[PDB]
């Protein structure tokens, strides 16, 4: 509302704000001197926080060079006394709160009871050279013989967090709005501890509000927010998402995957909060080096819940332990031997360390099976709910917006579509999805047009009358639905990771049946690190072309086998015994098998095994046949297959490097190249740290989720409405705040 802001600016509000700042600073000083008015002090800063909130609301929509900021700086310099005094009070309070946690203050306390004399406190403050003489006297007066430094420090710290945040936001907004203001620069230089302390808790998300204008949005960051953001699960998930999206190359839909990743990260955040509390020596040396480089009723229920949570917390450690166990048992398996009779072939263990290898192998296999079972249980407990939430979210969004399940049909194939149609009838469909009333939303959207009865029957609602009564209101075994459980089991049995876990369990069971089956567990070394996974993905990257080339090789070999049978049958004499000669080309199957077995891996053509035709007829014909076979098989087809595989691996590695390079030279949000930001020293670093950070955007989104709708500002309400509309136009989309106001900022 530009009119209201202009009316407020042209009215006499400013004199009232000056007077309010003066009386509030004097009241704050007086209550700081006293001690029994903590309730009045809390009310004062709550009201101060509200006043700064109103000031920021007034500053919303202010242009880089506008009259509003001019009146701000005019009133700031007009009433510099009280505001400077209160900012000094905040500065000394924060400095003392930081000092009490430092070793400088702890090195001067002499009483073990947590008390220090007033003279000793003054001497400590003078040694620290942080507070002036009047400041030290004021701090001494504020404190209630014992100074009670810890209690006095932490009593006012918690209430002052909101007001300090509000004033820090206010000053940051003025500094960013109107640069080159000597009064504003001096005022910012007056208070630097507050800004530094509130810097990790402050966000600078930039969005396009209206009229294609870039605006700065400041939101709230809690300590627990960054505390939970530092876990490596969320960092790894972010890395996978960004790598996948950059390989995809999508630009128009890139924001869609970004929002989906943000929602998945929020769900993972919630789940983490929920679960929060001779030749032997050489072989041994080689195995050790390989491992080293690779490494680089109620009571029962609560006990089960705690065990499941602990297992979920250490899932990666459990997987690493399982891989180590598999390495150990297969290294133990490396000491096997066969003898005709036991000390019908018999597999008997070598004595080695006086027969200690067999019980060790047995215990290793038992422990590996147990660890694998706990691993699959932990995977089901940890990553399955994220998949369930993603699938439910996708289905609900598609049904709500696309409407291809009521107006249209899933069509042929689409097994996922048929599965999603099956669960549509299931009650409590959005069990993991945040919005539990998607059915009512799609009802009011399209069901009345499409039929209030047919749509409700298809959606499997319990009762429309019951829902209306609930809206107008003004055991465990029976509660669980069989259809929902079977749908969850079916969708679990289709996820690739769950299939891999089931294959691992089957391999462990087979190893229990026969110890030699445990060798398949070392295939997990491909998934453990990214290079071997890249090799495996290269193997199947060009599968169609590889199979086509294999088919060409097969048909060429078949044609040459037919030619050899028709004419060159005499020279196919592998056996050197004249008494019982062996004809390798007496039949199509035998000759084709011999060709595919020797002629494709010989490396010099089939002529190496075939007898020399110099002493027999058709010498030139057979020489030409051998030359063309070599040229058309080894030089061409085998080289083509090898080049396909090698170039697939090279292209995959090239993409993995190019994604990183593009992220280092281009940012994710607006995509402006770092060359433009290279003019400013560390400009790209500042941009990627404060301007267009993904972490800042996700923190803002989930803080707006946490904050009530009534408390939203105009920009926050607009961005929330845009998010609810499933349309993202507030993103910068190649527009930068500095670039938009380059002339004025210079």
């Amino acid at each position: 509302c530009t009119g209201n802001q202009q009316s407020l600016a042209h009215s006499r509000l400013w004199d009232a704000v000056v007077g309010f700042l003066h009386v509030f600073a004097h009241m704050m000083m007086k209550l700081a001197q006293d001690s029994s008015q903590i309730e009045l002090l809390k009310e004062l800063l709550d009201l101060q926080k509200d006043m700064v909130v109103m000031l920021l609301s007034l500053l919303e929509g202010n242009v880089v060079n506008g009259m509003i900021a001019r009146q701000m700086v005019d009133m700031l310099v007009e009433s510099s006394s009280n505001v400077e005094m209160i900012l000094k009070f905040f500065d000394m309070f924060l400095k003392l709160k930081d000092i009490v946690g430092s070793e400088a203050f702890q090195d001067y306390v002499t009483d073990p009871r947590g008390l220090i004399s007033k003279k000793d406190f003054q001497k400590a403050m003078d040694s620290q050279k942080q507070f002036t003489g009047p400041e030290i006297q004021f701090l001494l007066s504020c404190s209630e013989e014992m100074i009670n430094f810890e209690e006095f420090a932490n009593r006012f710290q918690e209430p002052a967090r909101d007001i300090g945040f509000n004033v820090a936001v206010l000053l940051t907004n003025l500094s960013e709005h109107v640069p080159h203001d000597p009064r504003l620069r001096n005022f910012l230089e007056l208070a630097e501890s507050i800004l530094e302390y509130f810097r990790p808790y402050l966000g600078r998300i930039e969005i396009m509000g209206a009229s294609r204008r870039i605006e700065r949005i400041y939101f709230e960051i809690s300590e627990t927010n960054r505390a939970q953001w530092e876990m490596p699960q969320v960092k790894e998930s972010k890395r996978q998402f960004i790598f996948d999206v950059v390989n995809e190359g999508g630009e128009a839909e890139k924001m869609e995957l970004f929002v989906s990743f943000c929602e998945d990260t929020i769900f993972e955040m919630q789940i983490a909060a929920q679960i929060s509390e001779t030749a032997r020596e050489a072989a041994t040396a080689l195995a050790a080096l390989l491992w080293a480089v690779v490494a680089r009723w109620g009571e029962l229920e609560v006990q089960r819940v705690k065990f499941l949570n602990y297992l979920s917390r250490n899932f990666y450690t459990l997987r690493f332990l399982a891989l180590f166990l598999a390495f150990a048992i297969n290294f133990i398996l490396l000491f096997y031997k066969v003898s005709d009779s036991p000390p019908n072939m018999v597999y008997y263990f070598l004595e080695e360390s006086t027969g200690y290898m067999e019980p060790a192998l047995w215990c290793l296999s038992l422990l590996h099976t147990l660890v694998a079972f706990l691993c699959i249980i932990g995977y089901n407990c940890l990553k399955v709910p994220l998949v369930i939430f993603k699938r439910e979210k996708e289905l609900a969004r598609k049904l709500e917006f696309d409407g291809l399940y009521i107006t249209e049909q899933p069509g042929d194939d689409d097994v996922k579509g048929q599965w999603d149609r099956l669960v549509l009838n299931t009650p409590s469909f959005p069990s993991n999805y945040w919005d539990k009333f998607v059915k009512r939303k799609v009802l009011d959207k399209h069901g009345d047009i499409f039929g209030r009865e047919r749509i409700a029957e298809l959606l499997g609602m319990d009762l429309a009358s019951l829902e209306i009564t609930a809206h107008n209101e003004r055991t465990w075994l029976m509660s669980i639905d069989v259809k929902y459980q079977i749908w969850k089991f079916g969708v679990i049995f289709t996820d690739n990771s769950f299939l891999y876990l089931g294959w691992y369990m089957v391999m462990s069971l087979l190893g229990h049946y026969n110890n030699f089956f445990f060798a398949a567990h070392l295939l997990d070394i491909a998934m453990g690190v990214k290079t071997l996974r890249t090799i495996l993905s290269s193997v199947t990257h060009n599968g169609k072309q590889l199979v086509m080339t294999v088919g060409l090789l097969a048909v060429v070999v078949y044609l040459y086998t037919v030619v050899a049978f028709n004419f060159f049958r005499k020279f196919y004499n592998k056996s050197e015994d004249e008494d019982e000669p062996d004809m390798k080309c007496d039949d199509m199957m035998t000759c084709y098998l011999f060709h595919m077995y020797v002629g494709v891996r010989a490396g010099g053509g089939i002529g190496d095994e075939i007898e020399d035709p110099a002493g027999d007829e058709y010498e030139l014909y057979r020489v030409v046949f051998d030359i063309t076979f070599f040229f058309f098989v080894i030089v061409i087809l085998l080289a083509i297959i090898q080049g396909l595989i090698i170039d697939a691996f090279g292209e995959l590695r090239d993409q993995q490097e190019q994604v990183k390079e593009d992220m280092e030279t281009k940012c994710f949000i607006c995509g402006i190249g770092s060359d433009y930001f290279d003019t400013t020293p560390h400009g790209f670093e500042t941009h990627t740290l404060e301007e267009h950070n993904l972490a800042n955007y996700m923190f803002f989104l989930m803080y707006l989720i946490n904050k009530d709708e009534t408390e939203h500002t105009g920009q926050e309400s607009y961005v929330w409405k845009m998010y609810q509309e499933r349309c993202w136009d507030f993103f910068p989309a190649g527009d930068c705040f500095r670039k938009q106001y380059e002339d004025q900022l210079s």
């Binding site: 060009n542 080049g643 396909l644 090698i646 170039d647 697939a648 292209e651 090239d654 390079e661």
Partner: protein, 33 residues
């Protein structure tokens, strides 16, 4: 404009800062190197 990033998918010889659009085998997607 005409110059392309190091491992950017180029189009033909030159047309890049590295000026060499070689391909590492039997596949498309020539890139500067």
């Amino acid at each position: 404009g005409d110059c392309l990033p190091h491992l950017k998918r180029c189009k033909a010889d030159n047309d890049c800062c590295g000026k060499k659009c070689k391909r590492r085998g039997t596949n498309a997607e020539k890139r500067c190197r």
